[PDB]
Amino acid sequence: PPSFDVTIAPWLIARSRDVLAAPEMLGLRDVLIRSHELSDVEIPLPPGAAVLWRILALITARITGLDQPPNKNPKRKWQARRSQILSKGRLDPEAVDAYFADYSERFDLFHPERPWLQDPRLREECPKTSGVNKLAWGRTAGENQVWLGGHHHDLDPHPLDSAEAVWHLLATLGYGPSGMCTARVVRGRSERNVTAGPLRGTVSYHPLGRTLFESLILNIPYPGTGAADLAFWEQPELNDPLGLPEESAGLAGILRLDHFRHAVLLHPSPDGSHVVDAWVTWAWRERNISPELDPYLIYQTSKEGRVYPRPAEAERAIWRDLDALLHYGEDGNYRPTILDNCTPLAQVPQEVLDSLRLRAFGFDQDGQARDKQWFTATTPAVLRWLADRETDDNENARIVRRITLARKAAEALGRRLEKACKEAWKESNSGPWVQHGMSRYWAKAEPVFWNIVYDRPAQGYTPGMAGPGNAFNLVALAAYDEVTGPYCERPRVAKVVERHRSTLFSNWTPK
Amino acid sequence: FAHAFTVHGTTVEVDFFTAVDDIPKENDHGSGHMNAGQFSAGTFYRYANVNLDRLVENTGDAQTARTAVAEFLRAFLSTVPSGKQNATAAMTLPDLVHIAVRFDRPISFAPAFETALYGSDGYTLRACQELNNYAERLREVWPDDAIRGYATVENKTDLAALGERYDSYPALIDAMVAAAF
Amino acid sequence: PPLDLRFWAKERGLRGKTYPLVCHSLDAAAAALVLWNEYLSPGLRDTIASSMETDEEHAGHCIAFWAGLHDIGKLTREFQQQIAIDLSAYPGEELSGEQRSHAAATGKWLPFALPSLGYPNGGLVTGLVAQMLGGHHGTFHPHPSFQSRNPLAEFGFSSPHWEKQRHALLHAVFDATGRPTPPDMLDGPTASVVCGLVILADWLVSQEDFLLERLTSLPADGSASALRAHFETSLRRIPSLLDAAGLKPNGLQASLAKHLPCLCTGPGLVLITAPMGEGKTEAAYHVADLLGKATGRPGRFLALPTMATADQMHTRLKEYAMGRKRGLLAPWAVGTIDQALMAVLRAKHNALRLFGLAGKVVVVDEAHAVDPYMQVLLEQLLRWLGTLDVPVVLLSATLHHSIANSLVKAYLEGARGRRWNRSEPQPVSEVSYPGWLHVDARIGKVTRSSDVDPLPIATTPRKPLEVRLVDVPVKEGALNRSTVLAKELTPLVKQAAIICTTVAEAQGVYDLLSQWFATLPDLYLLHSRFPNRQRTEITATIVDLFGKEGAQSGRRPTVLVATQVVEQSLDLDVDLMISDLAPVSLLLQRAGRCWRHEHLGIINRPQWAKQPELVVLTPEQNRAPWFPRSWTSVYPLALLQRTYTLLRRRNGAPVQIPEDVQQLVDDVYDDDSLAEDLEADMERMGEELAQRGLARNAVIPDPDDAEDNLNGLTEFATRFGAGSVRVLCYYVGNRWLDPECTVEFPEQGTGREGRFTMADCRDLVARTIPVRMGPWASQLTEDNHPPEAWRESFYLRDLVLIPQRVTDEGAVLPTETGGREWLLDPCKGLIF
Ligand SMILES: [Fe+3]
Ligand SMILES: [Fe+3]
């Protein structure tokens, strides 16, 4: 029978901390056990990476972290403990096999009974099949138009590699459209609709270090003390489509791995290394918001008391690795809690912290069913090089002070410009300018950033001074002034555009 | 097919326009809807390549291919887009047409128009003689045995580097498609 | 280095004068000490001192020095350069433009300078104390994350001159405070309460005059002598501002007072559940105060979900024993539940109010009228108080096992500092009525009435109540009250309570009965939306009619149409009462009035009434039931369906109070057979869990989750959306407060600079009316906005103005406000 278990089957692109030549495919247990030998692991899809890194962190926390706080000043003692595992250096192989021993039967993707994070009952009970196209991302589904991402005419379905199948699967199981999916007949009841993904339209922030090991344990959020729960593949009995999803205070319920809003399935091929058909449909119909908000995302509060994740923006990805630099700052309410409990000094890491790097997996999308773009963002190691190469304490501090300053002020004027354009266009008619203004603003303002980091003569301000010298502010005046320039001719638009244009002039600290 | 950019810096110009309703109340001048539509004029440069080499294969009858490329060139000069033409009739013909048959690689003359042209005078003659100049230095720096022909709606200048000045567009196209094999 | 006196600490309203920073630091520290001895309770000081492994002497010393450092971050350049001050003396540290606040400056500089004084570099104590005082303006900042081996210079502190001066100030206040020892450890909560302390002392000495007051004996220099003197003079008289600011028993009582004095060993909580109006108050303050003595904190605090209860028991209960967020700062204070619950709400300056609740053993009321949202909010609140070793008490009517279970469970979690695991058995899966419950912190054993006393506890005797569902015809989705009117209200004219679902049949049934009343019993209206004064006169003429003085006075009658206002501690005893379909809990509260005081038995009423009979209005069949859209838009459909199905299987049998019905309010939540509509059942269950989830994402973390770090204590004008708000309806046309356009609606009042007197508070509050949250609140206008001069008062901001337009001759017009027109009539009150 066809079978494919993530334990030993190679599906993760992994590369060691060595030469950095010829990286190759590794399974889950293999990349975990010898993580100490591997630099890092990755998969081409940033959504699939944002969920992959969550299950990896949850596994390493199932064995390494022990994902269970003791009871004597728990938080503190826990930080100590994990600092000891970090001090050791690697994983215990008998612990890895000791954890799979309890679940060696769970990880098969094509298990004929209770597969890996799929719904076996959904095999029957579904009149039609959703098709592999809907499972694969960037691939034309039934109603989409066949222009982009390679033609796929709903027919001659190019079978996907089981690796690509677990990538797209793991991503769709995370980020997922909302609305009009394949119908299911539950207990004689049919309901064709589906809810959105839990992480849909949000940027994720995962810290990464020199070796994959410290990255894994640094990606361990403090397990909220509570009723110990299990991830999706550990539950002994398959969930009920009706009924309220089980509640979980434990990390398995805060990493969004206890219950998913979707339910996919892979139809195996006789060969066993290809998927031919798939099923994508609703798994839970009654709404439920997850308590103990996600530590990876950045959350911002609106009026009325609701807290929501800051949505992604392709406009920020116009320059590479923009959000990656959040390790500087930090920043005013704009900081994930996982970082707020693993990057600072109130924890007990000693020297891996001096080589920590941030990474960001973002996939901007509309909250209903329309997708726009994905992008990864790994911080530039050069910004570390500059701080280390000089070996002068006062200069080592002046450089990082210059990067922190330039970054903070950069995004400050970015958002100040956003509200400037939103009020300018919303008041001109009594918007479409934000897209152009922001895109051109970051695209133009990042070479200035690299211009300030190398203390080279930048626009507006020459090297030598303390901080950013108030230069990209002038870059914001440039972008804003040109995006709305040809339209501020008549006095109406001129006076409103100007009235909102007299804000960029602040902070604006003189010479 | 290449994008068509102007040969001289041209800034958009705001055309203030208004709609007038024909049913007047006892408070006149209440026009239909005030608004502003941007327009711009100028002398565009255009360029395109046809690779009969890896073309005729996909087809066959060099005569059918010959008909397709000849009608293509005539359509390339003839056509003009259909954007807001019913409100700004901008139907025109190219003031200069240069078809060249190269046996090694296609080449564009876009960089000839890199340094924008300042005006207060016309731009067609200056553009013609400047394209000539660029064809001369490029021709004397990358020598090659290629065919060149051109038609022009101005008998003032003599364009040497552009080949043999044919009399008209369809004659040029006929002699060049024939000369192409 | 000689300390300079040019640097400022206060500049607002000093008429061109500058106040030295050192004097502010010192007098602030003095405030910390004097409040640490005169203000704070010995038991709470035992809690904080115990949690920090130190003793009163050195703990107080430490926190005093900490308060003396609260504003040390002011020694930047962007702070003093705010006004013209000569800075050419010490160059360097040019303007970068980070916009850092002085609180941020101190919070980021302290972790790297004080290690010369003994705190472990990079440790936890210096971090928690650093961010602790660095967030002295209500918002806490993250711990310092640096990437350069010279953190002092990367944060913008590079000039040795400036650093030498701030080190000089540090040492100055250090020997001035007596040079305390370093505490080996600290935890989050301790840092939070003491943070409330430091911000309190800051705002304290902060006030204007002061300032001008002592603004005469300014220090000529910065030597230890002059600073010792100034600090010593604040120590001379700080309490000036302190006092100047104002800071036959029943069975149950005999059983708690009898056996409870043995169990009162320490901090815990007592959940008391007694009948309405029976006197649960006496046992509440009796046990509450005995336990307060057991813990050693005199002041208390009661949170009530009303407004008149505060103004009535404020005096009723006092003779036997000013700005926003400082109300809780009084030793004896009692207010509503919103200002207390908001302490754990994720808002700025929460540590202040949390500190206010840290010193009082709090008591709370009506935990039955608390939706899952509010329930989990106050739930975590009492969990925190749990980890702050403060005992509490709760008064409530009958409560399901989930409520009690989850609350005592939360507090127990605060006692142990971690919540239960997979196998931990629930502490309260059974609760009696009347029945008390006491749980202790350090032991954890939960005790009830049944454990030691098998014999039941006696209460007010009464006749078993009977309920009879009557068939009411449905017209246009509404109900035809006419039928019931002419069916059961016939023997009344020869000889009454009418409870409605909402305003529809409040003014609907009152008008539907006004015609009838014109034929001529008496028809008076008292309901949800009446002018506080108007319904205070109606309530006076009712509490004196159907209440204590009704039987006791002797002029007892020979009809009352109301809303759920009867739900809150009213004195009522009627033989005839007619109400609509509602939750079993609501039937319990409202129905806790049928033959209320038969105990006294002095009212002689005709033979007509001989059995306690409540009639529940309900729609009928046309197989699962269905209810009106307006009744179930505020109540749960599945719940009401369970009430219907449960009342049907009674075969019109009596229900005893307080013994038989409690197992039915528990039962309705126990057996699923009472509801066959799975969609509705799991719908309201779905939305209750979704609301609780919508709550747990806007509240502070758990006790230990925030132990090592206090940043997760402020992630940012929010409030709560459920479910009532106090409103003011003014008449505009000109602004006048009365319907006869005599008293003008004032822009500001009678006081210094328009300051509102306490009597101004009692008057403007005496002019309110309660309106419930509705879709009209989504669309608010400008006329509803109060002027800026009014926002600085706590009791008046949450009062939106609903204007109305009176004409030239006095006619009142319903003015639209949020898609609806409001009209204040003297008979039916506000109409919309
Ligand atoms: Fe301050
Ligand atoms: Fe201060």
Side-chain angles (χ1 to χ4, degrees), chain A residues 1-63 65-71 73-76 78-80 82-83 85-339 341-510, chain B residues 1-30 32-45 47-52 55-181, chain C residues 1-205 207-535 537-832:
Chain A
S3 178
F4 191 87
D5 53 351
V6 301
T7 302
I8 62 171
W11 53 275
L12 295 88
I13 299 170
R15 63 179 65 191
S16 65
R17 66 179 178 87
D18 286 331
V19 181
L20 282 72
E24 60 87 20
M25 310 296 286
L26 276 77
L28 184 61
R29 79 144 291 136
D30 291 331
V31 74
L32 187 61
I33 189 166
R34 63 188 183 96
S35 68
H36 192 195
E37 284 79 1
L38 277 296
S39 66
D40 57 353
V41 71
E42 62 184 359
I43 63 168
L45 275 78
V51 181
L52 182 66
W53 203 260
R54 283 179 172 87
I55 62 170
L56 261 65
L58 187 143
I59 289 297
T60 308
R62 298 293 295 166
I63 61 171
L66 277 296
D67 70 5
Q68 61 91 30
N71 294 132
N73 193 0
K75 184 177 182 180
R76 189 64 180 171
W78 179 72
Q79 299 176 356
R82 72 175 179 90
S83 74
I85 295 89
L86 174 57
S87 68
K88 197 265 182 182
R90 63 184 180 179
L91 271 294
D92 190 359
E94 288 82 4
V96 177
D97 294 332
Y99 172 74
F100 287 164
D102 292 331
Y103 300 102
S104 65
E105 191 264 332
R106 305 294 298 168
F107 289 168
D108 193 359
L109 281 170
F110 304 104
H111 193 275
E113 296 92 7
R114 190 70 181 273
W116 185 63
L117 60 83
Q118 285 102 23
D119 192 73
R121 290 180 291 110
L122 190 154
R123 177 66 179 87
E124 64 270 16
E125 187 181 0
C126 293
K128 291 182 180 180
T129 62
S130 297
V132 67
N133 293 321
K134 290 178 70 67
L135 186 144
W137 289 92
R139 184 165 291 174
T140 66
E143 191 66 28
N144 290 319
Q145 300 192 359
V146 189
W147 191 263
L148 302 171
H151 323 57
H152 294 87
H153 192 268
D154 194 73
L155 295 166
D156 64 2
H158 181 197
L160 291 174
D161 294 330
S162 297
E164 295 286 336
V166 67
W167 292 351
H168 294 172
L169 175 140
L170 190 62
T172 303
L173 184 139
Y175 303 168
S178 66
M180 303 304 160
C181 283
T182 303
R184 290 176 65 188
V185 297
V186 177
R187 296 180 182 92
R189 180 180 177 181
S190 178
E191 207 176 3
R192 196 178 62 248
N193 196 357
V194 67
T195 301
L199 300 173
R200 181 172 180 84
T202 59
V203 181
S204 66
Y205 294 141
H206 299 88
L208 185 143
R210 296 174 294 172
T211 309
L212 196 148
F213 174 72
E214 62 264 15
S215 298
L216 287 175
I217 60 174
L218 280 174
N219 277 111
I220 305 301
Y222 172 70
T225 303
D229 199 357
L230 303 176
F232 193 77
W233 62 89
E234 282 83 357
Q235 293 180 357
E237 197 266 331
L238 185 61
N239 58 4
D240 191 1
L242 270 70
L244 288 183
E246 295 292 328
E247 63 273 15
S248 177
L251 61 88
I254 74 171
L255 268 71
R256 283 87 173 95
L257 299 178
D258 57 353
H259 63 85
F260 301 101
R261 297 296 176 186
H262 290 86
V264 300
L265 281 71
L266 301 179
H267 186 273
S269 66
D271 185 74
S273 178
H274 292 284
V275 172
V276 179
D277 189 77
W279 288 274
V280 177
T281 183
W282 65 273
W284 293 97
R285 184 50 179 260
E286 297 176 356
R287 175 74 270 175
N288 186 358
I289 185 65
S290 178
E292 189 63 28
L293 60 82
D294 195 4
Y296 296 98
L297 309 183
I298 297 170
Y299 290 156
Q300 60 185 357
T301 305
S302 66
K303 261 76 89 106
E304 287 92 10
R306 286 236 211 316
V307 176
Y308 72 99
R310 188 180 68 186
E313 286 178 353
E315 311 168 2
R316 291 181 63 86
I318 197 68
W319 170 61
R320 304 283 290 165
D321 62 19
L322 178 60
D323 291 331
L325 296 176
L326 67 89
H327 191 248
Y328 297 91
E330 283 176 350
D331 183 74
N333 285 316
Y334 291 104
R335 64 190 299 267
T337 62
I338 186 167
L339 188 145
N341 202 0
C342 294
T343 299
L345 274 299
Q347 304 304 109
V348 178
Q350 279 78 17
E351 58 90 20
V352 295
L353 192 152
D354 201 3
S355 181
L356 186 62
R357 292 174 66 249
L358 267 294
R359 191 167 61 187
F361 301 106
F363 183 58
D364 58 359
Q365 283 169 326
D366 187 73
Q368 293 176 355
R370 186 167 61 246
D371 311 330
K372 187 161 74 175
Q373 196 179 2
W374 60 69
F375 60 91
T376 188
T378 177
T379 189
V382 185
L383 295 177
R384 175 60 64 193
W385 182 257
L386 271 71
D388 294 331
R389 189 267 310 277
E390 290 185 355
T391 67
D392 189 359
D393 295 332
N394 291 319
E395 292 293 327
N396 194 180
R398 289 287 293 273
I399 292 174
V400 298
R401 169 150 120 54
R402 185 173 61 199
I403 295 89
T404 57
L405 279 155
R407 203 269 298 163
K408 289 183 180 69
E411 267 80 359
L413 289 175
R415 278 84 58 85
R416 187 179 293 272
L417 188 63
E418 286 183 354
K419 67 99 174 181
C421 288
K422 287 173 70 175
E423 290 180 353
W425 174 258
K426 189 174 174 66
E427 189 66 27
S428 178
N429 297 114
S430 69
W433 290 353
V434 180
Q435 185 178 2
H436 303 286
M438 297 310 143
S439 62
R440 192 176 296 171
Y441 168 65
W442 278 291
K444 186 186 287 185
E446 289 298 325
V448 179
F449 179 80
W450 289 100
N451 195 0
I452 298 169
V453 71
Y454 287 102
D455 68 5
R456 294 183 293 112
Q459 180 58 255
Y461 287 85
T462 61
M465 57 192 73
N470 198 358
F472 43 78
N473 193 358
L474 185 63
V475 178
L477 293 174
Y480 181 78
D481 197 4
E482 66 185 0
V483 66
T484 187
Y487 299 159
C488 66
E489 296 294 328
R490 58 186 177 181
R492 182 179 175 88
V493 184
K495 69 178 183 291
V496 58
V497 160
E498 176 57 27
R499 186 171 64 246
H500 293 287
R501 191 179 183 273
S502 180
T503 62
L504 282 75
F505 285 166
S506 297
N507 198 0
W508 191 261
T509 61
Chain B
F1 214 98
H3 289 281
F5 59 92
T6 68
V7 309
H8 66 285
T10 61
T11 61
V12 299
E13 52 188 354
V14 176
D15 187 1
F16 179 76
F17 68 94
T18 305
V20 180
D21 53 353
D22 291 330
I23 303 306
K25 61 183 179 180
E26 284 81 4
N27 296 115
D28 292 331
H29 303 85
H33 59 263
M34 188 184 293
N35 202 358
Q38 289 81 18
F39 293 94
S40 65
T43 185
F44 298 157
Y45 160 71
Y47 167 77
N49 298 321
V50 176
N51 168 16
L52 351 110
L55 189 227
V56 210
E57 279 165 18
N58 330 33
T59 27
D61 313 42
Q63 189 269 331
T64 302
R66 181 174 179 176
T67 303
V69 58
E71 321 303 32
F72 170 71
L73 296 176
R74 189 171 182 176
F76 173 77
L77 300 181
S78 178
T79 198
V80 165
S82 65
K84 203 186 285 185
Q85 293 295 107
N86 298 115
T88 57
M91 308 299 285
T92 301
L93 281 71
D95 283 334
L96 180 145
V97 174
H98 180 200
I99 296 89
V101 176
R102 294 184 64 86
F103 300 99
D104 59 356
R105 65 180 295 274
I107 193 163
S108 66
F109 289 165
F113 297 149
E114 185 176 1
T115 61
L117 297 174
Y118 58 95
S120 296
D121 288 329
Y123 290 107
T124 64
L125 193 147
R126 296 179 69 186
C128 291
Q129 66 185 358
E130 199 275 330
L131 193 147
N132 190 6
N133 292 317
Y134 184 78
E136 184 177 1
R137 59 189 68 188
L138 181 142
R139 181 179 178 270
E140 70 183 1
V141 75
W142 189 257
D144 190 7
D145 191 0
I147 302 169
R148 292 177 181 90
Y150 77 99
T152 307
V153 178
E154 57 91 19
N155 296 318
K156 282 81 175 176
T157 61
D158 287 331
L159 305 172
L162 299 185
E164 55 270 15
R165 186 176 181 179
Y166 285 91
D167 196 2
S168 67
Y169 296 163
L172 172 58
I173 295 166
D174 287 331
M176 286 300 159
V177 67
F181 63 92
Chain C
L3 279 79
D4 196 355
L5 277 300
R6 72 178 66 252
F7 301 103
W8 307 341
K10 179 69 163 60
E11 195 273 331
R12 284 88 170 94
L14 293 177
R15 276 80 61 85
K17 184 63 179 175
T18 66
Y19 186 74
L21 175 63
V22 188
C23 186
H24 190 93
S25 297
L26 270 64
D27 71 7
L33 284 171
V34 294
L35 269 71
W36 173 254
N37 290 319
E38 192 271 332
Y39 179 73
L40 282 74
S41 178
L44 62 84
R45 287 187 283 115
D46 191 0
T47 299
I48 178 168
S50 178
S51 67
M52 63 183 288
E53 202 178 1
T54 301
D55 57 354
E56 191 272 330
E57 298 293 327
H58 290 91
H61 280 93
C62 285
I63 66 171
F65 169 65
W66 294 349
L69 290 180
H70 79 289
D71 283 331
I72 197 168
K74 293 184 182 294
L75 201 60
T76 60
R77 172 162 283 177
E78 293 85 3
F79 184 76
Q80 284 81 16
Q81 199 175 1
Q82 290 176 356
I83 314 295
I85 191 66
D86 288 332
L87 294 173
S88 178
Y90 288 165
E93 287 185 356
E94 294 84 3
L95 281 77
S96 66
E98 274 176 351
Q99 199 180 2
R100 289 185 296 171
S101 66
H102 60 279
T106 175
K108 308 317 311 166
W109 180 67
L110 263 69
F112 307 101
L114 191 154
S116 177
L117 275 70
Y119 286 0
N121 193 0
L124 70 318
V125 298
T126 182
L128 272 72
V129 68
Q131 61 85 27
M132 184 191 82
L133 74 164
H136 74 277
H137 69 102
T139 72
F140 291 173
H141 290 88
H143 291 167
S145 179
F146 58 90
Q147 307 184 9
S148 66
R149 63 185 183 272
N150 190 359
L152 291 173
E154 73 92 19
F155 284 109
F157 298 153
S158 179
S159 178
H161 297 88
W162 292 93
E163 283 290 324
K164 191 171 178 66
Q165 281 181 348
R166 49 185 69 94
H167 276 288
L169 176 57
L170 178 60
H171 290 287
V173 68
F174 184 65
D175 67 358
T177 191
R179 300 180 185 270
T181 61
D184 289 331
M185 66 181 180
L186 288 172
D187 49 351
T190 290
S192 67
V193 291
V194 65
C195 182
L197 188 147
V198 64
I199 67 174
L200 197 157
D202 174 70
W203 294 355
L204 224 27
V205 310
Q207 30 232 352
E208 42 210 351
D209 35 59
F210 213 141
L211 262 295
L212 234 339
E213 305 199 340
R214 210 96 329 153
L215 199 57
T216 62
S217 297
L218 272 74
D221 56 354
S223 178
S225 66
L227 298 180
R228 179 68 174 86
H230 291 82
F231 181 76
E232 206 275 331
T233 57
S234 299
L235 290 175
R236 282 272 87 87
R237 55 181 301 161
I238 292 298
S240 65
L241 12 172
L242 274 292
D243 196 1
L247 60 93
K248 185 180 289 293
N250 196 5
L252 290 170
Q253 290 80 17
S255 180
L256 289 172
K258 182 68 173 66
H259 192 203
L260 192 140
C262 295
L263 293 175
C264 56
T265 309
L269 62 83
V270 175
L271 193 150
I272 190 66
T273 312
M276 294 297 291
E278 202 278 329
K280 65 179 73 65
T281 302
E282 282 79 3
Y285 69 83
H286 188 274
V287 173
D289 197 2
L290 185 145
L291 186 153
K293 182 176 173 66
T295 190
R297 59 189 70 191
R300 277 87 63 84
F301 176 77
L302 188 153
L304 60 84
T306 47
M307 192 278 289
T309 305
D311 288 331
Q312 62 92 31
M313 79 176 187
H314 179 273
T315 61
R316 177 67 181 270
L317 273 299
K318 75 176 290 183
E319 290 99 12
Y320 189 74
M322 63 184 74
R324 295 197 301 270
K325 297 179 288 294
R326 56 174 56 89
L328 278 296
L329 274 60
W332 287 95
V334 166
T336 60
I337 186 67
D338 59 358
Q339 79 271 18
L341 62 84
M342 194 182 287
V344 296
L345 190 149
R346 189 172 290 173
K348 63 177 72 175
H349 299 91
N350 54 6
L352 181 62
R353 290 181 290 114
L354 181 63
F355 171 73
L357 277 73
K360 301 174 176 66
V361 297
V362 65
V363 64
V364 297
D365 195 1
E366 294 185 355
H368 61 277
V370 173
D371 57 355
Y373 177 81
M374 207 63 71
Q375 180 182 359
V376 70
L377 189 154
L378 63 91
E379 157 120 33
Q380 189 166 1
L381 183 146
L382 66 91
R383 185 180 296 113
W384 250 64
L385 293 176
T387 193
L388 279 169
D389 290 332
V390 64
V392 304
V393 287
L394 165 66
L395 282 74
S396 180
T398 181
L399 292 174
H400 188 263
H401 309 95
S402 65
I403 297 170
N405 192 359
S406 183
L407 266 66
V408 306
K409 175 179 171 67
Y411 184 78
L412 182 57
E413 291 168 354
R416 49 172 87 251
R418 50 74 95 147
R419 59 176 66 89
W420 288 355
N421 300 114
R422 291 280 87 189
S423 179
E424 319 266 68
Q426 302 296 321
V428 178
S429 296
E430 52 187 1
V431 58
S432 66
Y433 185 81
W436 58 266
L437 194 151
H438 186 195
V439 64
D440 49 6
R442 58 180 61 87
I443 297 96
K445 297 288 101 175
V446 64
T447 58
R448 298 182 302 161
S449 302
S450 296
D451 62 2
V452 177
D453 192 1
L455 274 299
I457 300 169
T459 301
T460 294
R462 63 183 292 166
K463 189 72 182 294
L465 194 154
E466 285 83 1
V467 297
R468 56 180 184 178
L469 293 172
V470 297
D471 292 331
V472 185
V474 175
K475 182 187 286 185
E476 293 179 354
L479 277 300
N480 296 115
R481 278 80 64 193
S482 296
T483 300
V484 178
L485 263 68
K487 288 298 180 183
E488 199 273 331
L489 293 174
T490 51
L492 185 60
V493 295
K494 70 180 178 66
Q495 184 177 1
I498 307 296
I499 296 93
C500 65
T501 58
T502 183
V503 190
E505 48 188 355
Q507 290 178 353
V509 175
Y510 182 70
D511 282 328
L512 193 141
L513 277 165
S514 180
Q515 193 274 329
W516 290 83
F517 176 77
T519 297
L520 275 295
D522 293 330
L523 183 66
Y524 289 167
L525 180 58
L526 172 64
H527 73 85
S528 66
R529 197 178 69 257
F530 264 111
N532 53 356
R533 294 297 91 193
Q534 181 63 255
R535 74 176 186 270
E537 183 271 331
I538 300 168
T539 198
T541 58
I542 289 170
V543 70
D544 292 330
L545 182 64
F546 289 167
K548 51 178 183 179
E549 285 296 326
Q552 192 63 255
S553 57
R555 77 284 182 276
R556 84 288 183 276
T558 62
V559 181
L560 294 182
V561 297
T563 52
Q564 303 301 324
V565 183
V566 65
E567 184 183 1
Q568 189 264 330
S569 178
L570 289 179
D571 192 359
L572 185 146
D573 186 357
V574 297
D575 291 337
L576 189 156
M577 69 173 288
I578 300 172
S579 180
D580 299 326
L581 186 59
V584 179
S585 299
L586 197 58
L587 268 72
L588 279 167
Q589 279 74 243
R590 301 180 305 173
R593 309 294 173 88
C594 287
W595 292 9
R596 188 260 174 274
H597 66 271
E598 288 291 327
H599 184 194
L600 187 59
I602 64 171
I603 298 175
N604 289 318
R605 283 176 285 179
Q607 189 269 331
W608 175 73
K610 185 60 70 177
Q611 197 70 255
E613 54 92 18
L614 172 63
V615 64
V616 178
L617 276 72
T618 184
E620 281 77 16
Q621 195 178 2
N622 291 318
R623 64 186 182 273
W626 186 62
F627 299 146
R629 183 67 65 192
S630 179
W631 291 2
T632 60
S633 66
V634 66
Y635 290 107
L637 283 77
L639 187 154
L640 269 290
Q641 181 179 1
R642 288 180 180 271
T643 64
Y644 177 76
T645 305
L646 187 62
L647 292 175
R648 291 299 302 272
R649 68 186 68 188
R650 78 186 184 274
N651 296 115
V655 286
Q656 290 180 356
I657 297 89
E659 296 85 3
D660 288 333
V661 63
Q662 293 76 21
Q663 297 300 109
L664 276 296
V665 68
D666 292 332
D667 199 4
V668 66
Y669 287 167
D670 283 331
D671 59 355
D672 292 330
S673 179
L674 268 57
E676 197 270 331
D677 192 0
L678 274 300
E679 291 84 4
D681 187 73
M682 294 176 182
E683 181 180 1
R684 288 294 183 184
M685 188 176 177
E687 196 272 330
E688 66 87 20
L689 193 149
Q691 189 176 4
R692 182 179 294 113
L694 188 145
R696 196 176 170 86
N697 62 7
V699 181
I700 305 169
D702 298 330
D704 66 338
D705 202 76
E707 186 268 330
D708 201 3
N709 193 1
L710 289 180
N711 189 191
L713 184 51
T714 301
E715 199 180 1
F716 285 179
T718 316
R719 70 182 186 94
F720 66 96
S724 295
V725 66
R726 312 294 301 176
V727 66
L728 265 293
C729 298
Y730 77 98
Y731 296 165
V732 65
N734 194 359
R735 293 181 293 174
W736 49 78
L737 187 62
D738 288 334
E740 295 177 353
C741 67
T742 300
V743 173
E744 182 181 1
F745 195 69
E747 180 69 26
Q748 63 183 357
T750 61
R752 181 74 273 171
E753 292 293 328
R755 186 260 186 187
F756 292 98
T757 316
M758 295 297 172
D760 291 330
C761 175
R762 193 176 186 271
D763 291 331
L764 294 171
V765 165
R767 293 283 99 188
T768 194
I769 173 171
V771 68
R772 280 83 63 199
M773 180 67 74
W776 64 271
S778 296
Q779 294 179 356
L780 290 175
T781 55
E782 181 66 27
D783 56 4
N784 297 112
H785 296 170
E788 62 274 16
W790 298 356
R791 198 185 70 81
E792 64 265 18
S793 174
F794 68 97
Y795 55 81
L796 189 154
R797 176 60 192 89
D798 290 332
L799 299 176
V800 293
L801 295 173
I802 304 298
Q804 292 188 3
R805 187 175 295 276
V806 178
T807 61
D808 291 331
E809 294 179 354
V812 289
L813 188 147
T815 301
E816 184 270 331
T817 300
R820 194 63 179 170
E821 296 179 354
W822 307 89
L823 183 67
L824 275 176
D825 287 330
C827 184
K828 293 188 286 185
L830 191 53
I831 302 169
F832 82 99

